[PDB]
């Protein structure tokens, strides 16, 4: 019964093995602990928004949306309808990005490595969408606690439609490479099986629940924005292993395509941030012509808006699971406390029980099926 | 509404079992994957010929910072310190005093590019379009010191890139 | 896509589907890089009367 230290995204793993079997597996984290939560207390709410881009850096606008929803709830305001539709559209695009990354990185770690390139071409196209709407490819800072920063450019919807109508064939090529392959099935079937009750007690969420047959999805049970106005299906697993979770992720990619089609067809007209200049900055022309607009611009960009005192826990169905924020306001323009809840934290904490009685080569598969990014785990 | 991803039970009819046995013994799905890779070999690759070909960008793109001026050549910055106040990374350092003609101007305007997160909050906080994020992104450096920009460097960047900067601002200002 | 008929048939038969129908490379069907100016409407609080801030 020897000990192995598989050290240096970046993870240290201390495990005891007897022969080939894994007897114990303790992850050591903190190699990407940046002290985000302490840094946020020294910023205004707008200044704190861009940290959520860097929390889970495969799904940026989803973290943006969660933070914005928390601040909106504390502010007792609501975004305009068009902003909500834009938010849900880009949230589904972000879900597509995250699921591509998760599945192709899983396959590459197993050894496939061709679908990685095949689908990172599509990832580059969606990065183009991000850049055209915000000017940045990944760290976008587009979704604000009053709506969105800017309206869409005049030809963006057409190009999103053109992209989304060919993506199903790319998913089909992915499935042709992976779904029915006997080597992939032997690497994934009956690996990392977790029961429903254990998954509930261990704090799992998202696919890690739905793979075990739990019928739960935050966009269906606790809808935010315009989600209750779109229809889609929730894929549900049956054996609670890596193979069922992979199938669930592919099906969620397809359902994201469905939701994106609906969002494209029902995009409404109007403004894109809340018409309340004490929260959302005025337009540049108004700022340069009106006294109140100039004053409110000055104060919003120097002091920031004050948030009434109180505490909220706001959670969303991020592509990796339930992503939450416990936000405490003391009445000023800077948050008093911001605790970030990342699903990968609980998933990595459950890695030890998920890898009991398995081979060393199965720990990589379990890590890939947990969909871990250490930016959100360490914060 | 929910769907089952893996809830199908295989047929027990002799034909289904023989088809599964043929799949096991003759490796039909492996041949199918090989055919997929073969078909992908014969389609045109997505590679562009950098640096002779470039990646498409938008007028909203955030690149290297620049300081602008009016058509008269007088600088737009009037040292309000709004960009310094809003900078999430505290990357802007500003010092100001009355000029020899009584004008409100800066004597120090520094941006530490190794602290900057390129969020563009400074250009949207500016009331006179003085500080902007330009279109240039190919400004890698061999030392850490050359990435600490002072006012002369930013004014030189503005004078270098003003044509493209003005065209981009003209293209995008009706959304701002 | 400028691929010969024989190459198109070979890639279609190896893939098992029609590839020319859904190409992963983009062509003139994307929107132009120069667009007309937008107009960008205003929000509901842009009234000249009956618009006191204490009511909103």
């Amino acid at each position: 019964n020897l000990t192995l230290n598989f050290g240096p995204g970046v993870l240290r793993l201390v495990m005891e093995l007897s022969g080939e079997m894994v007897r114990k597996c303790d992850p050591h984290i903190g190699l990407l602990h940046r002290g985000t939560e302490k840094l946020i207390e020294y910023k205004t709410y707008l200044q704190a928004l861009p940290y959520f881009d860097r929390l889970d850096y495969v799904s940026m606008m989803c973290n943006e949306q969660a933070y914005s929803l928390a601040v909106e709830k504390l502010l007792n305001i609501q975004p305009p309808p068009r902003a909500q539709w834009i938010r849900v559209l880009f949230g589904e695009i972000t879900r597509l990005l995250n699921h591509i990354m998760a599945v192709t990185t899983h396959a590459l770690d197993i050894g496939a490595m061709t679908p990685f390139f095949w689908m990172f071409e599509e990832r580059e196209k969606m990065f183009e969408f991000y850049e055209r709407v915000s000017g940045a490819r990944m760290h976008a800072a587009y979704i604000r606690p009053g709506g969105v920063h800017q309206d869409l450019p005049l030809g963006l919807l057409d190009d999103i439609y053109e992209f989304s109508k060919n993506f199903s064939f790319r998913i089909d090529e992915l499935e042709e490479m992976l779904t029915n392959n006997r080597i992939w099935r032997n690497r994934t079937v009956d690996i990392g099986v977790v029961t429903a009750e254990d998954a509930l007690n261990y704090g799992f969420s998202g696919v890690m629940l739905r793979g075990s047959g739990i019928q739960w999805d935050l966009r269906k049970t606790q809808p935010y924005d315009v989600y209750d106005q779109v229809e889609f299906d929730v894929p549900i697993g049956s054996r609670g292993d890596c193979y069922d979770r992979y199938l669930c992720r592919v099906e969620e990619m397809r359902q994201s395509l469905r939701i994106i089609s609906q969002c494209l067809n029902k995009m409404p007209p109007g403004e894109i941030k809340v018409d309340d200049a004490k929260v959302s900055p005025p337009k540049r022309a108004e700022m340069k012509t009106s006294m109140e607009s100039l004053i409110h611009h000055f104060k919003l960009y120097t002091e920031g808006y004050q948030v009434p005192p109180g505490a909220t826990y706001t959670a969303i169905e991020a592509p990796k699971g339930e992503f939450g924020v416990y936000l405490v306001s003391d009445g000023s323009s800077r948050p008093y406390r911001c605790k970030i809840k990342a699903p990968g934290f609980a998933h990595l904490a459950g890695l030890d029980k998920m890898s009991k009685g398995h081979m060393l080569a199965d720990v990589v598969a379990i890590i890939g099926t947990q969909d871990i990014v250490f930016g959100e785990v360490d914060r | 509404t929910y769907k089952f991803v893996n809830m199908r039970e295989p047929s027990m009819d002799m034909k289904s079992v023989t088809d599964r046995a043929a799949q096991t013994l003759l490796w039909t799905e492996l041949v199918r994957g090989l055919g997929m890779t073969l078909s992908y070999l014969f389609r045109e690759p997505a590679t562009i010929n950098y640096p002779f070909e470039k990646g498409p960008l938008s007028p909203r793109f955030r690149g290297e910072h620049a300081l602008r001026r009016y058509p008269s050549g007088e600088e737009r910055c009037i040292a309000c310190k709004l960009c310094e106040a809003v900078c999430p990374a505290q990357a802007i350092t500003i010092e100001a005093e009355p000029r020899a003609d009584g004008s409100r101007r800066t004597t120090r305007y520094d941006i530490d590019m190794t602290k900057c997160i390129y969020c563009g909050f400074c250009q949207e906080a500016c009331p006179v379009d003085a500080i902007v994020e330009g279109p240039n992104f190919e400004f890698s450096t061999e030392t850490h010191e050359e990435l600490l920009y002072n006012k002369e460097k930013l004014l030189n960047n503005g004078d270098k890139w003003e044509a493209e900067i003005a065209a981009n601002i003209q293209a995008d200002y009706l959304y701002r | 896509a400028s691929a010969t008929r024989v190459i198109q048939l070979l890639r279609n038969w190896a893939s098992g589907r029609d590839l020319q129908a859904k190409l992963q490379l983009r062509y003139q069907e994307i929107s132009k890089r120069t667009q007309p100016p937008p107009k960008l409407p205003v929000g509901p609080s842009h009234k000249l009367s009956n618009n006191y801030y204490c009511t909103r």
């Binding site: 919807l157 998913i171 089909d172 359902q255 089609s261 494209l264 067809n265 995009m267 | - | 960008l40």
Partner: peptide, 29 residues
């Protein structure tokens, strides 16, 4: 004079977007 102009879907909407899994059976017993 000028009316509102912003990025909108075309009149009549967009064409149907395929999303269902399509893995055909080539065919040989």
């Amino acid at each position: 004079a000028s009316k509102v102009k912003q990025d909108m879907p075309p009149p009549g909407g967009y064409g149907p977007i395929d999303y269902k899994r399509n893995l055909p059976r080539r065919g040989l017993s």
